[PDB]
Nucleic acid binder design. Structure first.
Ligand code: MG
Length: 863
RNA sequence: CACCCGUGCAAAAAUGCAGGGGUCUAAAACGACCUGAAUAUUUCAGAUCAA
């Protein structure tokens, strides 16, 4: 399944002039040089400790055999022969868009006869892609509830507040909209950016810097998503030119987590440090703290080259720590067991690790990789056994009371040089994305930073290569941001420590308790006068608050609820849970082992029988079922009573209602996140082809103005009077549409599109108006087979409700008509408005055709 | 079981075999991370969360 070349230690194969070079795997993403090649003449490089020897060489292929771990012998192809097999016969390749020179011409100053510079640039374009996604999901959480879109840094608050007294209609409404923003309750969900702790309490920031926050991410969107022809295209890459109003707020928010961690570190982590001093009698306590700091905070147990937990999961599988006795003590155990291994492999077992890394690289099946983890595990279990049970028997409740109530004094002399830098040292770029992440979910943060560290590390490893070979590495004066890529990399690794750890929660307000019951269900006949009394009994205007805690612990403190209110609007959500099919599609994707865990709690005999009873249990759910919570809140969930058995029964139902509906809204906005990428790349590629001598035109009026110019076709009077021919395909403007089949099919689809529906298709995906109004659009559908179908029903029904009183054509009305007969998405209508990116073909196919969309749920092509 | 490319065979414009691709997609290898229903600087529960 996996490539034999990269198991033998081959990393890449570069082309320079007539010469050909070759690389190999080093430390992580470091690049080690190996044999160069000139027409069957190979000079070896790195004579000391080579990874693989090439045994046979020729013009069209390079054989190899590896020296590390599992010996693998493989084959490798020549770049210079690419596109030259059966037809000058040796020349550098070019990208499938035929756009290599203009990119080299822009970042760097000149064209090169290499392929090393272009592998670099396609990683720079991949961070603007990922930055173009999450900046859009951020603004939507603010915009959900024109102001946000036209927004820049040259308008400081002293200049913006002048528009209060303005006589103009726009400037007056622009400011009056700002006051309507800060005068909203929903900012409590964004407390990390909008609140500060200061008798003492937690309140909003000064009104000056709230503007500075949203102004700063508001241009991030308008920059990433657009081309920005002018001198503002270098905004993100020139952040040292900002006003002082923006730099200061970044420092204020970047320094509040570190001061929560490293101000007092010994006292809140006082338990684990004591429980370790017991096993490592011989070690000096001061350096142990240094290790436990850089283990826990900096996560240096996640850059080792292998996975510590997969070893952990295999060694203590059936050793008796999976009981319910070890539930609260569990994370205390895994934090330490992962440390005992980390200090093992760092100092004494360093050689046993390098063997593991060079083994997993040279593994061609997953059954091999899974075995070696289980091989090394039994060695670890017989070695680290008494130290483990010496930990578990120390975590027995009462012992933690004594260890938390105890006096200790330890020198921070060693530790204070491993601390995290404050905001005064790090750059504005790393501080910017931190601010951004505080408008996002959990799984979205990791995908952002984890993607960026790889793309900078990949950018690094090419720059050192081109130093070793004597090439022009100097960026142009405007893209000098990347010459310090070694710096911005490490800043992001520090950021991956505490971006996910610290979250500052607010004491719940009244309005949250209304959103908590609206999402959960309110009876029909109840009026506005009555619901404000329902919570008046919750908040007790003797005082019993057992119900206030139920609605705060099981609902508000859930990471699920914190997501649904950001991207949703809670009353739209309960109205959406009345779609039994979609709700049932989310249940039958869950394993039956989870279902039998939920069911046995919520019931007091097959899978699909249980799965129906959980559906209709969701469709009937109300706050009034939980108004009796004052009686059983105080009960402990683990005891054996009636209140406890009732309590967990009432808990899991909420945990199921929210968990199910977290998944639906998550997959749909992630599916939405792949089309914003597509319209980014359309305005990206348009300026590039236009610079290459081609003539496209304007695109904000017609999004199909590019892919026609790629073909060489046009419309004369609103439509295409040109027919199919092969002179166009062979004479296309990129390597994709040189083929005559997909040239033809896109032309067929493209002649039945229209200009108006496409320009609306952008404003529906880039603004997320499709799931902003989800219940209106998802009223009735027969079935749900995948999240691709569902999203493509909504965005079609959003266009029916938009094009209901307007002019349309025969092709559009025939598609909308097939949307009413069959209550689902018209497959031939997906690929009409999804035409504007046909100049890229494998993108067009993956987004228009199920089975090719998601790499985890594969299918079949159309043919 | 998607796209492109090199090779060997049968061909005569395209098909079988065996492989490669960071320069093809959300998408190179280990790893991190996601799919995922499974939060982590803090043992749990309870209590403390709008006047
Ligand atoms: Mg790529």
């Amino acid at each position: 399944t996996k490539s034999m070349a990269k198991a033998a230690g081959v990393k890449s194969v570069f082309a320079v002039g007539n010469t050909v070079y070759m690389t190999s795997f080093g430390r992580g993403n470091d690049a080690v040089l190996e044999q160069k090649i000139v027409d069957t003449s190979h000079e070896p490089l790195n004579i000391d400790d080579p990874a693989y020897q090439l045994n046979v060489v020729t013009m069209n292929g390079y054989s190899v055999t590896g020296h590390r771990g599992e010996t693998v012998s493989a084959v490798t192809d020549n770049p210079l022969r690419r596109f030259n097999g059966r037809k000058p016969e040796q020349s550098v390749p070019t990208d499938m868009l035929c756009l290599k020179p203009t990119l080299e011409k822009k970042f760097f100053g000149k064209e090169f006869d290499d392929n090393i510079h272009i592998q670099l640039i396609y990683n720079i374009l991949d961070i603007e892609k990922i930055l173009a996604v999450y900046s859009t999901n951020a603004i939507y959480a603010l915009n959900n509830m024109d102001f946000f879109m036209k927004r820049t840094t040259d308008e400081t608050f002293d200049d913006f507040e002048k528009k209060k007294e303005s006589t103009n209609s726009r400037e007056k409404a622009d400011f009056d909209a700002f006051e309507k923003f800060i005068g909203n309750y929903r900012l409590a969900y964004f407390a990390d950016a909008f609140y500060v702790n200061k008798k003492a309490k937690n309140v909003l920031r000064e009104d000056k810097e709230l503007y500075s926050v949203l102004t700063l991410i508001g241009k991030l969107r308008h920059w990433c998503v657009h081309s920005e022809e002018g001198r503002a295209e270098f905004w993100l890459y020139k952040l040292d030119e900002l006003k002082d109003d923006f730099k200061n707020v970044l420092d204020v928010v970047y320094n509040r987590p570190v001061e929560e961690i490293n101000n007092r570190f010994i006292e809140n982590n006082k338990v684990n440090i004591q429980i370790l001093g017991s096993v490592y009698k011989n070690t000096d306590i001061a350096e142990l703290v240094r290790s436990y700091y850089e283990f826990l905070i900096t996560k240096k147990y996640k850059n080792m080259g292998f996975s510590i937990k997969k070893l952990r999961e295999s060694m203590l599988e059936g050793k008796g720590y999976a009981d319910k006795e070890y539930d609260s003590v569990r994370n205390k155990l895994y934090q330490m067991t992962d440390f005992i291994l980390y200090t093992g492999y760092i100092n004494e077992d360093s050689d046993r690790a390098d063997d593991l890394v060079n083994t997993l690289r040279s593994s061609l099946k997953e059954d091999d990789k899974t075995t070696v983890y289980c091989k090394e595990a039994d060695y670890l279990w017989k070695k680290y056994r008494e130290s483990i049970r010496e930990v578990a028997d120390a975590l027995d409740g009462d012992n933690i009371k004594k260890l938390s109530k105890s006096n200790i004094e330890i020198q921070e002399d060693k530790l204070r040089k491993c601390f995290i830098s404050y905001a005064d040292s790090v750059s504005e770029f790393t501080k910017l994305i931190y601010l951004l992440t505080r408008f996002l979910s959990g799984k979205e943060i990791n995908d952002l930073v984890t993607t960026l560290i790889n793309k900078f590390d990949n950018i690094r490893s090419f720059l050192e290569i081109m130093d070793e070979l004597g090439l022009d590495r100097t960026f142009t004066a405007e893209y000098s941001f990347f010459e310090g890529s070694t710096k911005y990399l490490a800043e992001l690794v520090e950021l991956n420590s505490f971006v996910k750890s610290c979250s500052f929660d607010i004491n719940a307000k009244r309005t949250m308790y209304r959103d908590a019951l609206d999402i959960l269900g309110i009876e029909s006949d109840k009026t506005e006068e009555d619901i404000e009394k329902m919570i008046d009994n919750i908040l007790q205007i003797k005082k019993n608050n057992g119900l206030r805690n139920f609605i705060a612990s099981n609902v508000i403190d859930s990471n699920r609820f914190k997501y649904l209110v950001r991207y949703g609007n809670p009353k739209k959500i309960r109205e959406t849970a009345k779609c039994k099919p979609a709700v049932r599609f989310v249940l039958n994707e869950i394993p039956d082992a989870q279902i039998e865990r939920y069911y046995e709690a919520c019931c007091p005999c097959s899978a699909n029988k249980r799965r129906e009873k959980l559906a209709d249990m969701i469709a009937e759910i109300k706050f009034e079922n939980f108004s009796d919570a004052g009686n059983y809140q105080k009960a402990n969930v683990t005891s054996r009573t009636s209140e406890a058995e009732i309590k967990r029964k009432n808990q899991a139902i909420i945990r199921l209602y929210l968990t199910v509906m977290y998944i639906m809204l998550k997959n749909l906005v992630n599916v939405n996140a792949r089309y914003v990428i597509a319209f980014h790349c359309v305005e990206r590629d348009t300026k590039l082809y236009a610079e290459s001598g081609l003539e496209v035109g304007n695109i904000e009026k017609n999004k199909t103005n590019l892919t026609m110019a790629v073909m060489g076709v046009k419309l004369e009077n609103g439509i295409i009077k040109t027919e199919f021919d092969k002179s166009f395909a062979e004479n296309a403007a990129n390597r994709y549409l040189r083929n005559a089949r997909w040239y033809k099919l896109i032309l067929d689809n493209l002649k039945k599109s229209e200009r108006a529906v496409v320009n609306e298709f952008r404003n529906t995906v880039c603004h997320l108006n499709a799931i902003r109004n989800i219940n209106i659009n998802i009223k009735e559908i027969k079935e749900v087979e995948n999240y691709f179908a569902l999203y493509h029903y909504l965005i079609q029904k959003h266009l029916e409700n938009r094009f209901a009183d307007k002019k349309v054509e025969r092709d559009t009305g025939d598609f909308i008509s097939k949307l009413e007969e069959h209550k689902t998405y018209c497959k031939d209508f997906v690929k009409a408005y999804c035409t504007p990116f046909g100049y890229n073909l494998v993108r067009y196919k993956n987004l228009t055709i199920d089975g090719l969309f998601d790499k985890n749920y594969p299918g079949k092509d159309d043919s």
